[PDB]
DNA sequence: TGCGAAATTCCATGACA
DNA sequence: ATTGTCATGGAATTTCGCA
DNA sequence: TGCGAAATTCCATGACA
DNA sequence: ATTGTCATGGAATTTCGCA
């Protein structure tokens, strides 16, 4: 059996709700199952609409042989199931309650969640504008398992904005101060 | 007055008044029988006054002008005086158009990697579709991979909004543009400083320079017009399909789609190319660096029979902005300070600031 | 369906399926190992369906299109099927622009005498001077002698008013014009019938044809712009001086002013040419018939490396009027009825009336 | 002394008043003293203005070495005398009351007067519109003394509208009917 | 039968909505 | 059924002045 | 070692405000 | 301070299939 490639599979779930930024409440997260390259589309709800609205974007760049996702409302819906059939895209599903990404993906998705909450604390409401910059990061985040970032595996070259800031990302001591006082 | 012409009529020869001509006086004028008939020979004191008189009838060029004079007068080295007066005629200099073509064009090197250089222009305005009106086209230099963004104006405002989505994927080193209103804003420089993006601009009024995209515009407008035959121009909705379309389409002469040049693998598009199925990404990715570098690259054409290239400190003139009607199609002369390359120079006008311009909007100033 | 491909897989050869290739089946498809890898070989029943599929991705031309197919399928004489489909793609045919240039231009003969042919165009609009707005320029063919008339519109109305003053001097045999609104009026035909003047028209949208004047327009606009530097554009008042100016100015290449070509003697203008002072009018007038006939006259240029001339019954297409944006820049194809000369033909469109047009607004229809 | 040429001399007088046609009342008459070619400019009055208005026209075609004329108001006036000096034109005058055209000119001028009155009887008021056509005639009027019309001597070619209608021009029998009843 | 310089002629370039 | 033109100013050629 | 036909490559033409 | 491009479809070339 043949080697693994970018575009061979695309992993999606939705993140949210969250404190509204320019009236978005959700982030659609797509990670390339080979390179772990990430796309982040901010949406208004986990609806098959706002999904397809976004993917129509991404897919104007590249189309994935396969889309793996949990069994959410939006991804099962027959509407999405068509959009896929149309685009010649095989849909693929994580048996309810036993969700199965992959090493690299499982990881990258974790990296993401912590990453958001890290910076949307202190500006819980100014996060829409940082989606660009976040992406740039998790795509120039040097992966232990290869010598390579998404960016380099995707394009085969070095980015012009490297995050050789191997940075904490963890809820560093002070952000729990005005964190568990904003909710607790 | 009289001066030289005495010694002539007297008989003993003078320089440039060939002997076998019978230089007499008559009607109180210094006539001379020449093969064309007898022509008057005015005193050097009057010749400037005359040539001007002649020229100024219809601001005629060299031959046209001499031929009027010829009828009545004669003297030595005629045209020389005519040429003096033409290179002094301010109006001739700013209206007559050239007869000298520009030296051959430069084919700069294909940028090395993707994201080294991005070109960008605005197409528009167009037929309102969904209230949108222009498009922002962004072509990666190296690869030709291309992004479209439909906008309500050609504004710094919406120019930015878009590249903020673009620079999500990656950030480019340089961005080339037309000196158009939306790219020369102060606000845009800041946008790009912020991200560490060098802004570089086409000389003004010269899209050959931004032409990697101008050419990607042709190919875009082309494909919509095909998709909107016998259908109202509801283009907004195709922008996506078009974008996808072109990035995934062979340039016959390279034998690669912009998409492949940028990724090394077709996505799950139609007739996705198989060949490298069997190499690991690693193996692919290295072969990519291989192809990318060994990509066709055109040379400079031969120069035209009668082209000019630009010396330093030469006298040259810039083409008029958008000239009005009945307004000279050329600015007053100016001096070539530096030559950035055989097609781009820096000039100082009489204004007089420094300007960087394509030899294409310059004419060398006739006569010196 | 299956048909031909059985006997192939069976082993015993078929036409155009070269033997040393191992044509097997696999995945329920008739693959074949070729030097580029293994390619599928679809049944002739599906090939039209496929090529169309491929092309229709981005309405790509021949190479661009085959290269997409190549990735997956193979079969005999490929491009042949691709070309079939391209010459059938209505949209490709009305949008792609040419790559074939028109055959060399014709230099018709200089009309024989003055007043044989008059050319006429309208220049404008311009900067209101004294409420006037256009000019009517009239060039005599043979001589180049020229009349200007300043008008408030480009109207049959004022076109006539003027020639009524002109035909005071003499009446011309023919009048050439652009098919512009003011010369194609019904009312003008009557004006000219009345006087026994044959009206003849440039093909439409082609001023090369009326260009004896288009060129006299350049030279006119040029000289005003010189006379109105650093002065408001009050042109109305110069029209006279200009008119006089040009008619009395040498064309270097003939060595005569339009004025002289038409009269045989300079008037009491500046640098009036003397030479024929001494012959009776009779002697002059005959020498005129002499010059006039033995006047330079240019030949036809060489054709371009890749020009076309127009056969009869050929398929060709007319350039779109003033196309809108996102609208094909070419009309549907049509058939060349008569060839009036290598640069002018008569065509019938699918409308379908007869039209007379410059090969310059035609493209031969690619592919047959 | 040298031969005679077109443009060497230009003869002018004014004709009028006359029954107004489009509000003109006068015709300025210029005849080339060599070819006898004729120009006809209709004017509003014998004033140095309306003269110069017209001649500025004619002179945008050709300029005469000399202009001969009677001693009328308009031709003596220092204004006209300048206009001439300007254009480099020598002015020239017929000693009062002894007016001296030339054979050909004397004649042509006669030809003209009869010619007008011939046709501006019956449309005394529609004459402005016929000035074009009149000219055409007296310029294609074959001259006894040469073999030639103005038109041919001027241009050295044959006109495309010939008046080989050697026509009466004389107040033919009937036009004295409604002529000396319109004034007598 | 020949030189150097002037005079002439050549002709690619561009612009007429 | 109709159709390119032609001034311009450096270059390349031809002709002039003198021997 | 050489044919005829196909496949490929060449490259002038034109259009991007 | 910066700079032309490149799809297109006939033509001209080179390579394929078979001997
Ligand atoms: O003229 C323009 N484009 C067409 C063109 C012409 C020749 C070439 F080689 C390349 C392209 C202009 C253009 O594309 N853009 O983007 C402008 O901003 C512009 C502004 C003013 C005038 C023209 C253009
Ligand atoms: O385009 C026109 N003239 C410029 C031109 C271009 C190429 C040539 F070889 C000769 C001239 C038009 C023009 O001169 N006239 O008179 C028109 O009536 C006209 C009408 C519509 C479009 C263009 C022109
Ligand atoms: Mg632009
Ligand atoms: Mg016109
Ligand atoms: N370069
Ligand atoms: N002809
Ligand atoms: Zn001038
Ligand atoms: Zn098509």
Judge whether B74 lies within some domain.
yes
C43 C-beta closer than 6 A to ligand 6: no
Contact status, residue B312 vs residue B107, Cβ threshold 8 Å: no
Judge whether B111 lies within some domain.
no
Q: Are residues C233 and C262 in the same domain?
A: no
Please tell me the class of the D1-184 domain.
Answer: alpha beta
* Interatomic distance B8 CA / E14 C1' (Å): 46
Judge whether C36 lies within some domain.
yes
Q: Take atom 2 of ligand 1 and give the residue whose Cα is closest.
A: B207
Q: CA distances (Å), B106 to each of B46, B143, B209, B304, B307, in order?
A: 50, 19, 10, 14, 14
* Interatomic distance A175 CA / H4 C1' (Å): 54
Strand arrangement of the beta sheet that strand B134-140 belongs to = B146-151, B134-140, B117-123, B174-177, B198-201
* Residues framing ligand 5 (Cβ under 6 A): B 108-109
User: Could you identify the residue written with the tokens 């082609």?
Assistant: C206
Q: Are residues B56 and B75 in the same domain?
A: yes
**Between chain C and chain D, how many beta carbons pairs sit less than 8 Å apart?**
94
Query: Exposure of B209 by Cβ count < 10 A (0-12 exposed, 13-18 middle, 19+ buried)?
Result: buried
> Smallest CA–C1' separation from C82: which nucleotide?
H9
Contact status, residue B21 vs residue B39, Cβ threshold 8 Å: no
The CA C212 to ligand 4 mean position distance, Å, reads: 12
Q: Of how many residues is chain D composed?
A: 184
Q: Considering Cα of A12, then A62, then B164, then A134, what sign does the dihedral take? A: positive
Q: Are residues B202 and B239 in the same domain?
A: yes
State both tokens at A32.
């390339």
The CA B312 to ligand 7 mean position distance, Å, reads: 27
> Smallest CA–C1' separation from B296: which nucleotide?
H6
Contacting residues for B345 by C-beta, under 8 A, at least 6 apart? B310, B316, B336, B337, B338, B339, B356, B357, B359, B362
- The Cβ of residue C102 has, within 10 Å, a number of other Cβ atoms equal to 20
Query: Contact B229/C91, CB-based, under 8 Å?
Result: yes
Best mutation site among B261, B267, B286 for testing chain A: the one with the most A CBs within 10 Å?
B267
Phi, psi of C307, rounded to the nearest 5 degrees = -105, 175
Contact status, residue A101 vs residue A18, Cβ threshold 8 Å: no
Q: CA distances (Å), B6 to each of B23, B43, B50, B184, in order?
A: 11, 11, 21, 69
d(CA D79, CA B78): 39
Q: Are residues B164 and B286 in the same domain?
A: no
* Interatomic distance C18 CA / G6 C1' (Å): 12
Q: CA distances (Å), B288 to each of A33, B170, B221, B257, C116, in order?
A: 21, 19, 30, 13, 71
User: Could you identify the residue written with the tokens 């402005």?
Assistant: D128
- The reply, when asked if residue A70 is annotated as ligand binding, is yes
Phi, psi of A152, rounded to the nearest 5 degrees = -85, -30
User: What residues pair up with B199 in beta bridges, in sequence order?
Assistant: B175
Ligand in nearest proximity to the CA of B82 = 7
d(CA B281, CA B41): 89
d(CA A125, CA D67): 95
- Give the closest-approach CA distance of C285 to chain D in angstroms: 5
Contact status, residue D153 vs residue D62, Cβ threshold 8 Å: no
DSSP-derived secondary structure letter, D147: S
Contact status, residue D15 vs residue D25, Cβ threshold 8 Å: no
State both tokens at C247.
């008619």
Contact status, residue B359 vs residue B102, Cβ threshold 8 Å: yes
Q: Beta strand pairing status for A66-69 and A10-15?
A: parallel
Instruction: Tell me which residue of C124, D34, D33, D51 sits closest to D42, measured CA to CA.
Output: D51
Phi, psi of C119, rounded to the nearest 5 degrees = -100, 150
d(CA A14, CA A16): 7
Contact status, residue D48 vs residue D77, Cβ threshold 8 Å: yes
Contact status, residue B222 vs residue B238, Cβ threshold 8 Å: no
Q: Are residues C133 and C233 in the same domain?
A: yes
Which one of A40, A64, A160 has the shortest CB-CB distance to B268? Answer: A64
Judge whether B46 lies within some domain.
yes
Q: CA distances (Å), D176 to each of D123, D126, D170, D180, in order?
A: 14, 19, 10, 6
Resolution in A: 3.4
* Interatomic distance B20 CA / E1 C1' (Å): 21
State both tokens at B322.
């958008």
Q: Are residues C241 and C356 in the same domain?
A: no
User: Reduced to 3 states, what is the DSSP secondary structure of residue B190?
Assistant: helix
Phi, psi of B58, rounded to the nearest 5 degrees = -125, 35
User: What residues pair up with C140 in beta bridges, in sequence order?
Assistant: C118
Q: CA distances (Å), A28 to each of A24, A52, A92, A120, in order?
A: 11, 10, 17, 16
Q: Are residues C212 and C125 in the same domain?
A: yes
Instruction: Tell me which residue of B44, B94, B39, B45 sits closest to B67, measured CA to CA.
Output: B39
C-alpha torsion angle, residues D46, D52, D55, D56 (rounded to 10):
-150
Query: Hey, which bits of chain B come out as E strands?
Result: 32-34, 37-39, 101-102, 117-123, 134-140, 146-151, 174-177, 198-201, 307-308, 315-318, 334-341, 344-349, 354-358, 362-364
C54 Rama sector, left if φ>0, alpha if ψ -120 to 50, beta otherwise: alpha
Which residues of chain B lie closer than 8 angstroms to C223, CB-CB?
58-59
State both tokens at C18.
């070269």
The CA C203 to ligand 4 mean position distance, Å, reads: 12
Judge whether C110 lies within some domain.
no
Contact status, residue D26 vs residue D17, Cβ threshold 8 Å: yes
d(CA B359, CA B103): 8
User: What residues pair up with B336 in beta bridges, in sequence order?
Assistant: B347
d(CA A57, CA A55): 5
Which one of A34, A88, A158 has the shortest CB-CB distance to B268? Answer: A88
- Give the closest-approach CA distance of B114 to chain A in angstroms: 8
Does chain B touch chain A (at least 3 C-beta pairs within 8 Å)? yes
User: Which domain does C214 fall in, by range?
Assistant: 116-249
Could you tell me which chains touch chain C, where touching means 3 or more CB pairs under 8 A?
A: B, D
Residue of B207, B213, B221, B361 with the most ligand 1 atoms within 8 Å of its CB, for mutation? B207
d(CA D166, CA D149): 13
Which residues is chain A interrupted after (C–N above 2.5 Å)? none
* CATH classification at residue C157: 3.30.420.10
Could you tell me which chains touch chain D, where touching means 3 or more CB pairs under 8 A?
A: C
A156 has a chain B CB within 8 A of its CB: yes
User: Reduced to 3 states, what is the DSSP secondary structure of residue B313?
Assistant: coil
C340 C-beta closer than 6 A to ligand 6: no
d(CA C129, CA A85): 69
Contact status, residue B225 vs residue C327, Cβ threshold 8 Å: yes
DSSP-derived secondary structure letter, B330: B
Examine residue B352 and say whether the peptide bond preceding it is cis (omega within 30 degrees of 0): yes
Q: CA distances (Å), D181 to each of C94, D118, D121, D172, in order?
A: 75, 15, 11, 15
User: Reduced to 3 states, what is the DSSP secondary structure of residue B241?
Assistant: helix
Q: Are residues B186 and B261 in the same domain?
A: no
Pick out the residues of the known binding site of D: 8, 70
Contact status, residue D41 vs residue D15, Cβ threshold 8 Å: no
User: Reduced to 3 states, what is the DSSP secondary structure of residue A105?
Assistant: helix
- The Cβ of residue C311 has, within 10 Å, a number of other Cβ atoms equal to 12
- Per-position DSSP letters for C53-93, written without gaps between them: HHHHHHT--HHHHHHHHHTTB--TTHHHHHHHHHTT-HHHH
What residue spans define the domains of chain D?
Answer: 1-184
Q: Is C181's CB less than 7 Å from nucleic acid strand G?
A: no
Strand arrangement of the beta sheet that strand D38-43 belongs to = D38-43, D26-32, D10-15, D66-69, D90-93
Query: Hey, which bits of B89-133 come out as E strands?
Result: 101-102, 117-123
Q: Are residues C244 and C258 in the same domain?
A: no
Contact status, residue B239 vs residue B148, Cβ threshold 8 Å: yes
Q: Are residues C46 and C150 in the same domain?
A: no
**What is the number of domains present in chain C?**
4
Q: Where are the alpha helices (DSSP H) in chain C?
A: 5-10, 44-58, 62-70, 78-86, 90-95, 156-169, 186-195, 211-227, 239-247, 258-263, 281-293
Q: Take atom 1 of ligand 6 and give the residue whose Cα is closest.
A: C108
Phi, psi of A48, rounded to the nearest 5 degrees = -55, -30
d(CA B223, CA C92): 9
C112 C-beta closer than 6 A to ligand 6: no
Phi, psi of A28, rounded to the nearest 5 degrees = -80, 135
Q: Is C344's CB less than 7 Å from nucleic acid strand F?
A: yes
Examine residue C188 and say whether the peptide bond preceding it is cis (omega within 30 degrees of 0): no
Which string of b and e fits D116-147 if b means at least 16 CB within 10 Å?
bbbbbbeeeeebbebbbbbbbbbbbbebeeee
Taking the mean position of all CA atoms in its chain, how far away is CA B332? 18
Pick out the residues of the known binding site of D for Mg(2+): 8, 70
- Chain G bases under 7 Å from protein CB? 6-17
Helix axes C156-169, C186-195, angle to 10 degrees: 10
Query: Contact B92/C255, CB-based, under 8 Å?
Result: no
Contacting residues for B5 by C-beta, under 8 A, at least 6 apart? B30, B41, B43
* CATH classification at residue B31: 1.10.340.70
Q: Which CA-bearing residue is nearest the C1' of H18? A: C18
- Give the closest-approach CA distance of C92 to chain B in angstroms: 7
- The Cβ of residue C312 has, within 10 Å, a number of other Cβ atoms equal to 11
Most distant CA pair in chain A, distance = 54
User: Could you identify the residue written with the tokens 């009024």?
Assistant: B205
d(CA B344, CA B321): 18
Contacting residues for B185 by C-beta, under 8 A, at least 6 apart? B156
Contact status, residue C97 vs residue B221, Cβ threshold 8 Å: no
d(CA D158, CA D166): 17
d(CA B332, CA D3): 50
State both tokens at C313.
């019954």
Which residues of chain C lie closer than 8 angstroms to B275, CB-CB?
36-37, 71
- Atom index in ligand 1 nearest the CA of residue B211 equals 10
Contact status, residue B360 vs residue B102, Cβ threshold 8 Å: yes
Q: Are residues C135 and C210 in the same domain?
A: yes
d(CA C351, CA C349): 5
- What was the elucidation method? X-ray
Chain C residue closest in CA terms to B246: C58
User: What residues pair up with C146 in beta bridges, in sequence order?
Assistant: C139
Q: Considering Cα of C4, then C6, then C8, then C10, what sign does the dihedral take? A: negative
Q: Angle at Cα D99 formed by Cα D95 and Cα D100, nearest 5°?
A: 100
Contacting residues for C132 by C-beta, under 8 A, at least 6 apart? C126, C150, C151, C152, C236
Best mutation site among A24, A135, A160 for testing chain B: the one with the most B CBs within 10 Å?
A160
* Interatomic distance C132 CA / H18 C1' (Å): 81
Judge whether C33 lies within some domain.
yes
User: What residues pair up with C35 in beta bridges, in sequence order?
Assistant: C37
The CA C245 to ligand 2 mean position distance, Å, reads: 24
Q: What contacts 24+ positions apart, CB below 8 Å, involve B60-67?
A: B60/C249, B60/C250, B61/B86, B61/B92, B61/B96, B62/B86, B63/C250, B63/C252, B64/C249, B64/C250, B64/C251, B64/C252, B67/C250, B67/C252, B67/C255
Which residues of chain B lie closer than 8 angstroms to A4, CB-CB?
281
* CATH classification at residue C317: 2.30.30.140
Q: Are residues C240 and C308 in the same domain?
A: no
Structural element, H or E, at residue D84:
helix D78-87
The CA C120 to ligand 4 mean position distance, Å, reads: 8
d(CA A54, CA B167): 17
d(CA B357, CA B203): 5
Phi, psi of A29, rounded to the nearest 5 degrees = -120, 120
State both tokens at C35.
């030097």
Phi, psi of C319, rounded to the nearest 5 degrees = -70, 145
Residue of C214, C217, C219 with the most ligand 2 atoms within 8 Å of its CB, for mutation? C214
d(CA B68, CA B57): 10
- Per-position DSSP letters for A65-87, written without gaps between them: SEEEE-S-HHHHSHHHHHHHHHH
Contact status, residue B152 vs residue B162, Cβ threshold 8 Å: no
Helix axes C239-247, B44-58, angle to 10 degrees: 110
The CA D67 to ligand 7 mean position distance, Å, reads: 32
The CA B115 to ligand 5 mean position distance, Å, reads: 16
C-alpha torsion angle, residues C256, C257, C262, C266 (rounded to 10):
-100
Best mutation site among B29, B66, B228, B325 for testing chain C: the one with the most C CBs within 10 Å?
B325
d(CA C265, CA C281): 9
Q: Where are the alpha helices (DSSP H) in chain A?
A: 48-58, 73-76, 78-87, 103-119, 131-139, 150-155
Ligand in nearest proximity to the CA of B107 = 5
Examine residue B357 and say whether the peptide bond preceding it is cis (omega within 30 degrees of 0): no
d(CA A117, CA B110): 42
State both tokens at B157.
């405002």
Contact status, residue B276 vs residue B287, Cβ threshold 8 Å: yes
- Give the closest-approach CA distance of A124 to chain B in angstroms: 20
State both tokens at B144.
């030709």
Q: Beta strand pairing status for B198-201 and C334-341?
A: unpaired
Which one of B114, B170, B267 has the shortest CB-CB distance to A62? Answer: B267
Which residues of chain C lie closer than 8 angstroms to B216, CB-CB?
none
DSSP-derived secondary structure letter, C278: G
- The Cβ of residue C295 has, within 10 Å, a number of other Cβ atoms equal to 15
Contacting residues for D98 by C-beta, under 8 A, at least 6 apart? none
Half-sphere exposure of C137 (CA within 13 A, CB side): 28
User: What residues pair up with C364 in beta bridges, in sequence order?
Assistant: C316
Most distant CA pair in chain D, distance = 54
- The Cβ of residue A107 has, within 10 Å, a number of other Cβ atoms equal to 16
């Amino acid at each position: 059996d043949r080697p693994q490639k970018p575009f061979d599979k695309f992993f999606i779930d939705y993140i949210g709700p969250l404190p509204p930024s320019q009236g978005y409440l959700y982030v659609l997260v797509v990670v390339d199952g080979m390179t772990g390259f990430t796309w982040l589309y901010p949406t208004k709800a986990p609806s098959t609409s706002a999904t397809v609205k976004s993917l129509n974007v991404l897919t104007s760049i590249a189309i994935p042989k396969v889309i793996h996702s949990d069994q959410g409302a939006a991804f099962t819906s027959s509407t999405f199931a068509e959009w896929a059939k149309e685009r010649g895209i095989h849909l693929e599903f994580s048996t309810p309650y036993h969700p199965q990404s992959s090493g690299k993906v499982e990881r990258k998705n974790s990296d993401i969640k912590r990453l958001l909450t890290k910076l949307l604390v202190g500006r819980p409401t100014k996060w829409y504008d940082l989606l660009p910059v976040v992406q740039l990061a998790l795509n120039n985040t040097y992966s232990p398992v290869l010598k390579y970032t998404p960016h380099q595996l995707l394009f085969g070259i070095d980015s012009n904005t490297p995050f050789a800031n191997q940075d904490t990302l963890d809820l560093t001591r002070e952000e729990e101060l005005s964190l568990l006082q904003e909710i607790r | 007055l009289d001066a030289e012409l005495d010694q002539l009529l007297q008989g003993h020869y003078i320089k440039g008044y060939p002997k076998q001509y019978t230089y007499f006086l008559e009607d109180g004028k210094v006539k001379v029988s020449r093969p064309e008939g007898v022509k008057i020979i005015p005193p050097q004191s009057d010749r400037q006054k005359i040539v001007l008189q002649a020229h100024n009838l219809a601001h005629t060029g060299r031959e046209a002008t001499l031929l009027k004079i010829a009828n009545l007068y004669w003297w030595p080295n005629m045209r020389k005086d005519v040429v003096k007066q033409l290179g002094r005629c301010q109006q001739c200099l700013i209206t007559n158009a050239s007869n000298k073509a520009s030296g051959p064009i430069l084919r700069p090197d294909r940028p090395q990697k993707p994201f080294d250089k991005f070109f960008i222009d605005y197409i528009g305005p167009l037929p309102p579709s969904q209230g949108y009106l222009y498009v922002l086209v962004v072509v990666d230099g190296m690869t030709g991979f291309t992004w479209l963004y439909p906008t309500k104006a050609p504004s710094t405002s919406a120019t930015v909004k878009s590249l903020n989505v673009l620079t999500s994927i990656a950030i480019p080193k340089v961005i080339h543009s037309d000196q158009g209103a939306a790219f020369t804003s102060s606000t845009f420089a800041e946008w790009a400083k912020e991200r560490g993006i060098h802004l570089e601009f086409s000389t003004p009024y010269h899209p050959q320079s931004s032409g990697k995209v101008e050419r990607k515009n042709s190919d875009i407008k082309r494909l919509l017009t095909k998709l909107l035959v016998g259908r109202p121009t509801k283009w907004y909705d195709l922008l996506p399909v078009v974008q996808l379309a072109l990035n995934n389409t062979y340039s016959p002469v390279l034998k690669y789609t912009p998409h492949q040049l940028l990724f090394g693998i077709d996505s799950n598009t139609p007739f996705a190319n198989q060949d490298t199925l069997d190499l690991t990404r690693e193996e692919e990715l290295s072969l990519l660096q291989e192809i990318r570098t060994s990509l066709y690259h055109p040379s400079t054409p031969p120069a035209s029979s009668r082209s000019w290239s630009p010396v330093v400190g030469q006298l040259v003139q810039e083409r008029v902005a958008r000239p009005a009607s009945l307004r000279p199609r050329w600015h007053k002369p100016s001096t070539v300070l530096k030559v950035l390359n055989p097609r781009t120079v820096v000039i100082l006008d009489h204004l007089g600031n420094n300007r960087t311009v394509s030899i294409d909007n310059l004419k060398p100033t006739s006569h010196q």
